[PDB]
Design a protein around this ligand. Structure first.
Ligand SMILES: Nc1ncnc2c1ncn2[C@@H]1O[C@H](COP(=O)(O)OP(=O)(O)OP(O)(O)=S)[C@@H](O)[C@H]1O
Ligand SMILES: [Mg+2]
Ligand SMILES: [Zn+2]
Lengths: 91, 166, 48, 670
């Protein structure tokens, strides 16, 4: 097509240890939602990771609710939602 | 296994049991024993010499009438053949039983003679059954036919008797 | 030629019941005082 | 809403309710429907409440252990998830089951208004032992995601450590005011107090641990040689260290085949004793929950061997069964089959259905399995009714298959081969432990075979020095070792079942019997039965053998013969409950036959001479035959049958008394 793309193959051939984690992060960025519902026949690791993910979402929701309930400035909804997302994410 | 006789060479003067250093039990454990005698003949030495010398010259098999099967191709075909589990019907069972009876009677008759190759054994019956099942596996079939048993018995006979008799 | 192993935590359970003399509860009470104090009708400390 | 234990999917309330409904609503007809056994369903057994009856009999006997089958949890519809929760999370779910069992014990006596007191139920700790949790996958096929999961292992016990006291409560005393207090353990960590608990005395570092005042618990480590059902390509068997606790300590002896179900653990191991630095690679072991020592496919262990062990099991309240329970209906069927006129031929024929003919060999194997009764002297001597059999003969006479069947059918036998075994490997040896780096004593094949049958293939190939060990085992059923580490006498009551070939690997009628067997007279005198199995070529015999051996290949999965389970329980009942004695009529026949063959041996080594050990073999074989027919006395018919079996094993009817030769065509019948 003519566009410029870097030589990813040689970079993987010379730095496979870094590109393992790079690929894992890229995969974790866009992970499709599970169509199948979790049940009692799944592995213990799967239910542990599912509980960890649900705990992560509950922590994020609780922190967002707490900071929104504080209402520091009493004041652009997209800007305040973005800033609230960043402060919840790094807090 | 690969083996040599007593003296390093086969001699027709002694019985086949005499020059084979092998006890009767471990002889019976072998399903097939191949005597491989180096009989000097003018006609066969021509073909052996030209075959070996062609292999040494063109670095490959001389016969161009058929393509040899590649070892990976042979491996996957044998893997497919090993999945089959053939069974034996009543007719092939009767054929095997009568063949075993005739083999035992022939071994009884030839036990005293110098042409003895051992004593006929139920392990020979199991070897015939095993060879017939392997031949049925090679046909990728779940059934064992008569001709598989005939080929197994032919292999058993030409293992020892055909070459020692000549 | 490996790196530092890292140590990190995440809140899971409730733990033991909090105490008033605990430093975290004192900090939380101080934050509540800063955010929720009203002099007459205005939150003076958060605006300050 | 619904509360879930973190890291699991186990809810305490839901699990307690489901297990309670399972306990009060399970019937064995559900188990038979699950196992696709519809026509095996009967009325009076399956329709009753199974576990309610089990808790009732537990209350009546005063026991506190419930054996739970997880396949029964699969049978019930509401607990179908719970089965998985039992496999995935044994720690929480087993405690939930114990609490539910205690609640049901309370409920069964408050609801029906029994006279049993509630306080004994309350002070007692009830625990459950789940078993049959699934297929017996090998531990080398397990993965790190299988940690803390219930697994089954069938294996052989090699050795066990002595009882190890592990700390449960710690006892601390003050040095200056003698104030004593006890602290419980918390996940393997004990918080020793820095300062004294009293308000009067508060001296720091004044509390010292008293190692003898504090309470401990039992912990034992058992080395199990795993024998999985499926073995991968080129895999060599290994050993697993498995931990038993509390009541299960000293329930497993060395050399028995057991089915251990337990949770799969892994702990880190310290690299050095002086340092607390732990190794990254974890060490895996099995925390044992339940042990099964009985199998329907094989016999039970000899009860005369473990009498003091049985009394110690009664004292320790471990409640593990070494022998199978016999009901009233199957005992009635045992008494019915004992009244058969063809009982001897039926029992001998039902030994090895895949092995054709060998009727006398099967009769001898059957008598050896039954064995003569054991007479121990009040003065201190001991006579053991162990029957020893040698099978000498032509190649391919299905004798190695007889050894295989005997090895599979015995409780604690060991199969071994000539020239692959040594004297030290047969008696005892000293090894280095991988955990403690200590010199431990481990048993040989003969010691591990005690109370069972030691099968030796290719007995002629064994060295004379290695065969010289066997003499004391054959004669006195002991091994008296005096080595650097071991100086003691160990009981080895193992019946020796050996297989052998002639010198020329085939029987030669020109040479006599003794030269064909090629054994020294001290070793050959100790065999109760010597079976010369011959290959005589016939028309009808070869035809029938070929038809029998070819009919197995008609289908993929292959008169009347008894099932293996019923045969095992019949032999076990006869061994346990029948101790025949010799009468004067039997004594007259014994003395007459012994003197007759001593006189017959006067003719001119080349021939087997009669021996006093042959008289003892006559007594043992007659006692075994009387034990088979459930008779408590040994009559003349049993002695005549023993003499007939001894004569027919060596083919004395075919043998010429003078030259010692055997003629094939004339006297032998195929
Ligand atoms: N009478 C028989 N009944 C049933 N199977 C037999 C009989 N005779 C031989 N066989 C079978 O033939 C094969 C020969 O193996 P084995 O008989 O076990 O060897 P063996 O009897 O120990 O003699 P060796 O090993 O040479 S000392 C096995 O598969 C046996 O099951
Ligand atoms: Mg053998
Ligand atoms: Zn004090």
């Amino acid at each position: 097509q003519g566009t410029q793309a870097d030589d990813l193959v040689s970079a993987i051939q010379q730095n496979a240890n870094h590109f393992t984690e790079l690929f894992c992060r890229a995969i974790d960025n866009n992970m499709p939602l599970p169509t199948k519902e979790i049940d009692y026949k799944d592995d213990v690791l799967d239910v542990i990771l599912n509980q960890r993910r649900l705990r992560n979402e509950r922590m994020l929701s609780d922190r967002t609710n707490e900071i929104r309930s504080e209402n520091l400035m009493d004041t652009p909804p997209s800007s305040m939602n973005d800033a609230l997302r960043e402060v919840v994410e790094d807090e | 296994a690969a083996a040599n006789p007593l003296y390093g060479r086969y001699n027709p003067r002694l019985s086949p049991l005499d020059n084979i250093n092998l006890p009767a039990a471990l002889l019976s454990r072998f399903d097939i024993l191949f005597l491989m005698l180096d009989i000097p003949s003018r006609d066969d030495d021509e073909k052996l010499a030209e075959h070996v010398t062609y292999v040494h010259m063109h670095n490959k098999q001389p016969d161009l009438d058929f393509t040899p099967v590649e070892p990976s191709k042979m491996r996957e075909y044998i893997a497919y053949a090993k999945t089959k589990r053939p069974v034996m019907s009543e007719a092939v069972n009767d054929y095997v039983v009568q063949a075993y009876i005739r083999l035992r009677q022939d071994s009884k008759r030839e036990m005293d003679s110098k042409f003895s190759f051992g004593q006929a054994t139920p392990r020979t019956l199991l070897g015939i059954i095993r060879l017939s099942q392997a031949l049925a596996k090679l046909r990728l079939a779940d059934m064992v036919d008569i001709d598989d048993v005939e080929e197994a018995l032919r292999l058993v006979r030409v293992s020892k008797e055909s070459l020692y008799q000549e | 030629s490996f790196d530092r192993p890292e140590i990190y935590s995440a809140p899971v359970l409730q733990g033991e019941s909090p105490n008033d003399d605990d430093n975290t509860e004192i900090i939380k009470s101080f934050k509540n005082f800063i955010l929720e104090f009203r002099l007459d009708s205005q939150f003076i400390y958060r605006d300050q | 809403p619904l509360r879930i234990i973190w890291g699991t999917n186990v809810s305490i309330q839901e699990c307690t309710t489901n297990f309670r409904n399972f306990l009060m609503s399970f019937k064995y007809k559900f188990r038979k429907i699950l196992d696709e056994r519809e026509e095996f369903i009967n009325n009076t057994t399956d329709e009753e409440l199974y576990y309610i009856k089990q808790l009732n009999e537990m209350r009546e006997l005063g026991t506190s252990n419930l054996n739970l089958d997880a396949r029964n949890l699969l049978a019930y519809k509401q607990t179908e998830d719970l089965y998985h929760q039992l496999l995935n999370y044994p720690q929480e779910v087993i405690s939930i089951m114990d609490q539910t069992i205690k609640d049901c014990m309370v409920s069964l006596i408050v609801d029906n208004n029994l006279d049993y007191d509630l306080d004994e139920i309350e002070t007692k700790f009830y625990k459950v032992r789940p078993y049959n949790v699934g297929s017996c996958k090998g531990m080398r096929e397990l993965n790190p995601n299988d940690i803390d999961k219930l697994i089954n292992l069938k294996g052989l016990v090699l050795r066990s450590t002595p009882v190890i006291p592990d700390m449960k409560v710690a006892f601390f005393k003050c040095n200056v005011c003698d104030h004593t207090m006890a602290v419980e353990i918390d996940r393997g960590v004990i918080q020793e107090p820095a300062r004294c608990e009293r308000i009067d005395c508060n001296e720091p570092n004044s509390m010292s641990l008293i190692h003898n005042r504090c309470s401990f618990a039992d912990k034992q480590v058992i080395k199990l040689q795993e024998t999985p059902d499926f073995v991968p390509d080129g895999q060599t068997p290994h050993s697993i260290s498995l931990c038993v606790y509390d009541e299960l300590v000293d329930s497993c002896r060395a050399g028995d085949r057991i089915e251990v179900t337990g949770t799969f653990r892994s702990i880190p191991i310290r690299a050095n004793s002086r340092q607390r630095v732990l190794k990254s690679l974890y060490k895996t072991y099995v925390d044992v929950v339940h042990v099964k020592k009985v199998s329907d496919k094989r016999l039970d262990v000899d009860t005369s061997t473990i009498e003091q062990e049985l009394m110690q099991n009664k004292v320790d309240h471990n409640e593990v069964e070494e022998v199978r329970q016999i009901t009233d209906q199957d005992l009635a069927k045992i008494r019915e089959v004992a009244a058969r006129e063809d009982l001897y031929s039926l029992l001998a024929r039902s030994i090895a259905p895949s092995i054709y003919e060998l009727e006398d060999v099967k009769k001898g194997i059957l008598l050896q399995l039954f064995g003569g009764t054991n007479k121990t002297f009040t003065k201190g001597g001991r006579y053991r009714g162990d029957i020893n059999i040698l099978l000498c003969g032509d190649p391919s006479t299905s004798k190695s298959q007889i050894l295989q069947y005997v090895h599979k059918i015995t409780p604690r036998g060991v199969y071994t081969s000539g020239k692959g075994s040594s004297a030290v490997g047969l008696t005892a040896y000293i090894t280095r432990d991988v955990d403690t780096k200590q010199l431990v004593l481990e048993s040989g094949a003969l010691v591990l075979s005690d109370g069972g049958v030691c099968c030796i293939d290719e007995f002629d190939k064994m060295s004379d020095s290695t065969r010289s060990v066997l003499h004391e085992v054959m004669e006195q059923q002991t091994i008296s070792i005096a080595k650097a580490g071991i100086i003691t006498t160990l009981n080895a009551r193992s019946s020796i079942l050996a297989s052998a070939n002639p010198i020329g690997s085939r029987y030669n009628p020109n040479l006599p019997v003794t030269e064909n067997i090629d054994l020294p007279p001290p070793l050959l005198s100790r065999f109760d039965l010597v079976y010369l199995v011959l290959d005589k070529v016939d028309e009808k015999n070869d035809r029938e053998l070929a038809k029998h051996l070819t009919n197995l290949y008609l289908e993929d999965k292959p008169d009347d013969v008894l099932p293996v389970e019923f045969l095992t329980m019949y032999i076990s009942y006869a061994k346990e409950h029948i101790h025949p004695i010799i009468t004067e009529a039997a004594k007259t026949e014994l003395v007459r036959a012994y003197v007759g063959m001593r006189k017959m041996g006067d003719d001119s080594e080349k021939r087997i001479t009669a021996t006093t050990r042959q008289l003892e073999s006559m007594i043992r074989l007659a006692e075994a035959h009387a034990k088979m027919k459930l008779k408590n006395v040994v009559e003349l018919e049993d002695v005549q049958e023993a003499v007939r079996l001894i004569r027919s094993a060596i083919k004395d009817y075919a043998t010429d008394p003078k030259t010692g030769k055997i003629d094939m065509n004339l006297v032998q019948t195929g």
